[PDB]
Write a protein that binds this ligand. Structure first.
Ligand SMILES: [Ca+2]
Ligand SMILES: [Ca+2]
Ligand SMILES: [Ca+2]
Ligand SMILES: [Ca+2]
Ligand SMILES: [Ca+2]
Ligand SMILES: [Ca+2]
Ligand SMILES: [Ca+2]
Ligand SMILES: [Ca+2]
Ligand SMILES: [Ca+2]
Ligand SMILES: [Ca+2]
Ligand SMILES: [Ca+2]
Ligand SMILES: [Ca+2]
Ligand SMILES: [K+]
Ligand SMILES: [K+]
Ligand SMILES: [K+]
Ligand SMILES: [K+]
Lengths: 146, 360, 146, 360, 360, 360, 146, 146
């Protein structure tokens, strides 16, 4: 790999604070044990949603090369992905996984500095790559990282 | 129930005999301070009035020495009622008789007339033994308050075994009025101790030790400033200026809790404060999430238009807006943690209320 | 009565801290409400035993002339009846409502000042009025108040 | 709803009439300190400007004495709105009229012109009665803050019965900014009191009592050092240096809670600290358990080989290793007790979450 | 069980050898202070008695230097019992031998006789090294208390892993008697330190540094007054007056918790206080609700009778009565909130008692 | 993962460039204090060595002014890595460039050589501006600790959102070692401030202001004694003796919590104390209940035998024994209330454990 | 309306602290959520009684013109309606929604300043408008506001 | 016995803090009562394992000569048996009551001072007295006490 050896040697003990059984992977139960021993009480849906953000293969569990991609973001100072992922959730009040034209036209007009309702029609027409009428999460990050 | 009407009769009679003893002791101290001052300002021209005030002190300590015996002759008579005794020789213990003899000796000390402005060596300690006639205060304070006789107080105290005494009524008056007590106590100590020190150090020739110096020396010692403009000179001055310093450290460690209680929130006001800061932080998050798109769309606009310096001007503002958004959100989550930490107790009763729906 | 009028007038409000309904009597429920609002948690047997100490008629409830006999003891300084009633319970470890010869001969010998085991046989022979072999509660108070 | 538009109208008008009264009172104090200083540094060469400043103080206290009446003529007019009155004679109580007369007397005191550098005996107490025109501050602070008029604050405060007043907004500003307030308050007391003391003790011949001495005397008295290089001489100096000492003891007993809050852990940071010390102590236990075998096997080795001094060398290290292992384990169990003591509350909600699985 | 009878035998022998070492060290300090004083007050006329007291100090430090070795020869003999050793060379570690050598050096220092009233430069530091023979106190305090040998204490401490040591018995004596300890400790420090300072600054010609000055300098420094009438002059005086000030700040921060505990209510007394204030506030509400009708019916009476000034007189009293009723009710609800906030814990056990009725 | 190897590379390089900057700043302050002292003790005989030390200060502040730029050229290079930038003009903000310019100005101030023992007016403030090169300390303390780079700390801190910064590592070192830090901080302030004050007041003729006076003036001011034997004379002395007093009040309000924590019981030791006092009070109750019969049976014995004075002798002892029994029992029930109040939390988990038996 | 525009614009956000769903009305559940997040625990009957005081149409729910009448009382200093509504409840100890002649003649005689029992017969005869023998809540406020 | 009389006289009251009923023996219930009154919460398996360490006859309960052997260890300063019994548990991570060759070769190599993997093969061959391939608890204490 591009990573050195002693860094892998020190990420192994970071992985074995979660993987207590030594099975080679992390489930929601081993995560919830650490989350409760740190003093906070998640729900099952919250734990499963924390798993589903970094599960690349889609097996429902996290192994060590998936753990490295998670620790590549939480090691630096400003995790620029989460601060856009939750600014997407500040807009999506209905929780449908979409930003409609009405949600965007409600937020960007009255709050900010006097932005027109004509510019929102150009912005929504530029944002919808698939032509789905409204703004997804996938196009929302591709607009940020352009 | 003949042993319950007689108990209230004797307890009212002891309230009267504990009021009049305190009046006749305050009169003795008030005629002692007058003698000690008109011996100083007067000299030997007023010897008639000095003898008259000394004899009046002797009369108004004889009647106090009679009323203390009249109070214990009601307390033994009450203790014989409460236990069904008839022979009084059974009731009068040894330690109580020793208490009576000590209590009569302490209220017996006064500057009695045996037959140029300083006091003597003996009639300055007998005169400052009059101030030990202030054990009569907590007795009269207890018996004048109704808590020793009021039936509802006694029944609720008997269900809970609290045993009404002096340290209970002291905490009552200290926790219902911490202001009047702590102010009129220090303004009754900074004048009594200022008079006692201005007995302990009087200088005839220069007039360098009277109340004009001690009313400045004692608050300065009490607050632990200690300038050093005036300093006590005798040995009895140096004892009193250490007692004042010890009482000052103790009353500072007393005031440090009373001021600690008052500035904190009421329990109902902190919830209003948190519930308003929550909807302020939601408004700031919804401002900042619009700032992020306001910069990112202009960045995409000038990215397509290839205005390069405008792109390098707006990408910096994009990074600054993300930096502001993270800080606002981390204020918001700390405040939501303060909310989730405080309403845990009501959450317990709420989960028990949701468990109350499990009977049918 | 031997009691005066204003004292009855002030015991009435003391009785109406318990008798909240104004029914004329006190049950275990109205007692337990006050006992829990004062911050302690009794059991049903403890509340019923508190009722049975001053219930003279035997109706299971307390009326006002029974309340006066209770307040004739809790008004004075040293309630000399309770301090003998529970010194009786310090001995009766088995809880049978009796002090056997073995319980008395255990306590009074080793604890105190070197009291003989011959004096206990005279004491138990003098104490048993009914000849029940052991010391009751009724003879125990009649020995104290002799 | 005509009694709700008029209420906001009158409340905005009182905010304006409580801003302008504070401006015209600050102008009066600021022209009072200027008169008291240019009488000292000037003498009798500037009598025209002294008369001019005195007349300007009279004008700028007349307009204050008009605006206070204009504020109470809006507050009575508000109280008539809130209760549906029409005859104003019903609204104006006796205690409120006494409050108005006292409030007009207190803002009426000023050094008025009747017609060598010291002040008079009367125009130095009228000049130091201008500082009692600072009851206008909490009124203007309350009415300029939006909490008396903002609808969401009033609805949430009416659900919780909190009754927004002066001591609520004081706790608001004291619990949102404990730093700016406690610094700009002591740096506004150590200059006001330093000016008042440098009025109370001015010495003409030697220049031994002005601000250069009082700006050193007052922080030293406030912090309860009291060197004694400078000591107040008059009686009005000795009153002020006791008020400063009392305020210093009270602000020490105030700062002792603010510093007590800040150095403690955040609730979320203590769990990270404990969860890291746990996996440090596990590593130390696994080191020490290997030290024990590392010495015991060498002891068995030299026990078979009968190297006697090596056996007496390694048995000592075995006993020392067991002694170290016990101490590491007793650190570990105390820390696990600290963990099991703090997360009891989350354990309660966890057991209730496991009791939530009992419906079907 | 031969390793359990011998343990109690050795532990009683160490209690005796820890009592006699403390007696022979207190004798050494008591004969040191006598030598240092009769060298000052005596001079060179009493050289025989100075030599005799120095030789007695040498004897009563030789027997102390023997009893410390006799104590460690029991402690090694105990450590060999507890682990089944036979060769004593295994038991005696290196750090324990270093502790023995240091402990023999510290109790070895004394003003030994080598062969006008001041001490020397060396025999004033050897004489003030005798005060380092007070590490023998916590050893004897631990071994004379029964907690190291009483079987029930050791079994309950072994179930709970508490490990009885010096800091446990210190907290025992500090939490069973905070009064005797904190008074007889400061009255044992204000005389020991007053003697050490009156060694550090003796002036022969003027008699300006002895105990009459230091017994006033040290309480004044301890309470942080610091007048400045007496000030230490040497360098060893200035070290001791900083150690006293540090101990004074620490004992103030110690007394600030002991006084904080005592003035608060007992847990059972606060419920009696709240339950009585509840039925006082109910009586005040029932007074005020009658005041409201007493004014409103007279207002309706004079409204029908059209006595207009009586209507404007009673409508004002109606509004004042409603204003009083609101304040009484808002006292009542704050007190009911204090009641509902404190008995939440008993409410938890009560709801669990009502959940206990769900088995059948 | 090329943006994760480079991050550890740059972070190690910044740890080296934050160690060497602190070494080259400590060398500058250490060569500044040497110049300020050998100008005083030397005069004009050592002008060569004064010029040499000034030029060495200029060299060892030039290399510091290069290493600060070499540290920010790694921090911008790290910020470009963490966000995927390529053009460095986007990364360098305005506030960060202002921080760099201010940080280079503050470490630029030094007594540079322009070409009888006092310092100048300008090269005494440039020399006392070297002490503002101690913002380099928390930077190096953060980067040398492993918590910014250790992976397990960062993962557990990211699960709990704690954001490792300077105030976290300060609380780490303050809560793992409150003793070393609070002692070696005050013994590093009472020498730095003692040198700064002994710059602010040097008197040439009498030698009345050097370190021998300030090492006594500053602990006395810090502990708020303030004798008044030595008092600062200039204006810069009077600023420093107020800063020391403010830091003394703050460190007293800091030590008042550290001493409050230590003297309280451990949670496991209080249960052992209560469980032993319970079986002591049971033994005292069983003594007193035997005392009651021991007197009552002798009273019945002499009642039958009609020895009247023996009856009046033993009935008194009966009443005294009942009086002792009530006091012992009321100690016992207060202690049982302390037991029932503390183990309520374990009683909650016990009742939930008895509710755990309700599944089948 | 008589109210201005910006005041309606600021009462809308006060209404949308309760109406979280944006449905146009407030039920007891949305009220109880805010009441529990403020830290107090009502019952269902207490919440329903809080709703029924200002429900004008009688639909069981509160809309915005009903909210304005509620905020017209809680905006001013002394809400003169509640301080009479609960002084009515201080009398009605039986909770029947009526003040009988015995309740009034008990309270107004012994407590106050020596009021006669003859005046109560005139007061109760003047108060009963419907002739229902006893004092309602509707006549009680009409006596206060006369 | 070798023990004296007054020491037995003082161990009897130490035994009667547990044996509250005076039955002559200690069960897990009487132990759990004291364990809960001291403020800690054991499980049934933990209490039974605390009983099984000093139960010599194997009856499931503890009598007084079994109590004396327990107090012969907890009276001295360093209980040298427990500090080896739990250093045995630090190794046995699988909890099987055995130390395998892999567990020993994992712990003693990487942690300590650079101990070889050839010495572990000699140590395991010397330790297994029964030839069970792995290290028991009985041979583990016999290696310590050699
Ligand atoms: Ca796993
Ligand atoms: Ca996966
Ligand atoms: Ca949406
Ligand atoms: Ca009833
Ligand atoms: Ca009955
Ligand atoms: Ca029995
Ligand atoms: Ca709704
Ligand atoms: Ca409606
Ligand atoms: Ca009714
Ligand atoms: Ca048993
Ligand atoms: Ca057995
Ligand atoms: Ca294993
Ligand atoms: K001082
Ligand atoms: K001083
Ligand atoms: K001082
Ligand atoms: K002080």
């Amino acid at each position: 790999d591009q990573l050195t050896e002693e860094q892998i040697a020190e990420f192994k003990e970071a992985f074995s604070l979660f993987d207590k059984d030594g099975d080679g992977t992390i489930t929601t139960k081993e995560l919830g044990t650490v989350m409760r021993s740190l003093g906070q009480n998640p729900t099952e849906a919250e734990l499963q949603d924390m798993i589903n953000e970094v599960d690349a293969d889609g097996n429902g569990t996290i192994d060590f090369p998936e753990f490295l991609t998670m620790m590549a973001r939480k090691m630096k100072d400003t995790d620029s992905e989460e601060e856009i992922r939750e600014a997407f959730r500040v807009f999506d009040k209905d929780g449908n996984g979409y930003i409609s034209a009405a949600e965007l036209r409600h937020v960007m007009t009255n709050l900010g500095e006097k932005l027109t309702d004509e510019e929102v029609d150009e912005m929504i027409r530029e944002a919808d790559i698939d032509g789905d009428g409204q703004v997804n999460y996938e196009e929302f990050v591709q607009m940020m990282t352009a | 129930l003949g042993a319950l009407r007689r108990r209230k009769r004797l307890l009212e009679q002891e309230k009267s005999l504990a009021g009049w003893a305190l009046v006749l002791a305050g009169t003795g101290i008030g005629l002692m301070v007058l003698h000690a001052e008109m011996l100083w300002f007067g000299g030997c021209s007023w010897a008639l009035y000095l003898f008259l005030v000394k004899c009046t002190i002797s009369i108004s300590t004889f009647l106090l020495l009679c009323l203390i015996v009249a109070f214990h002759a009601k307390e033994v008579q009450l203790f014989m009622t409460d236990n069904g005794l008839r022979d009084w020789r059974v009731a009068l213990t040894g330690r109580q008789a020793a208490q009576i003899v000590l209590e009569l000796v302490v209220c017996g000390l006064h500057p009695a007339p045996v037959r140029p402005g300083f006091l003597g060596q003996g009639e300055a300690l007998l005169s400052l033994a009059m101030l030990l006639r202030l054990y009569l205060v907590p007795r009269a304070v207890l018996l004048r308050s109704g808590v020793l006789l009021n039936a509802s107080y006694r029944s609720i105290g008997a269900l809970n075994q609290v045993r009404f005494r002096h340290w209970f009524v002291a905490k009552l008056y200290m926790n219902t009025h911490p202001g009047r007590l702590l102010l009129g106590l220090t303004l009754g100590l900074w004048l009594t101790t200022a008079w006692v020190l201005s007995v302990a150090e009087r200088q005839a020739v220069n007039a360098t030790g009277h109340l004009s110096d001690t009313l400045w020396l004692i608050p300065i010692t009490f607050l632990t400033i200690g300038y050093g403009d005036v300093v006590p000179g005798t040995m009895w001055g140096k004892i009193v200026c250490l007692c004042t310093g010890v009482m000052g450290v103790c009353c500072t460690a007393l005031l440090v809790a009373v001021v600690a209680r008052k500035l904190e929130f009421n329990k109902a006001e902190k919830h209003v404060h948190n519930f308003m800061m929550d909807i302020q932080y939601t408004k700031e998050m919804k401002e900042s999430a619009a700032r992020v798109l306001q910069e990112a769309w202009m960045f995409y606009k000038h990215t397509r238009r290839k205005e390069s310096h405008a792109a390098r001007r707006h990408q910096r503002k994009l990074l600054a807006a993300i930096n502001a958004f993270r800080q606002v959100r981390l204020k918001h989550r700390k405040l939501r943690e303060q909310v989730n930490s405080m309403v845990d107790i009501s959450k317990m009763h709420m989960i028990l209320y949701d468990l109350q729906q499990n009977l049918s």
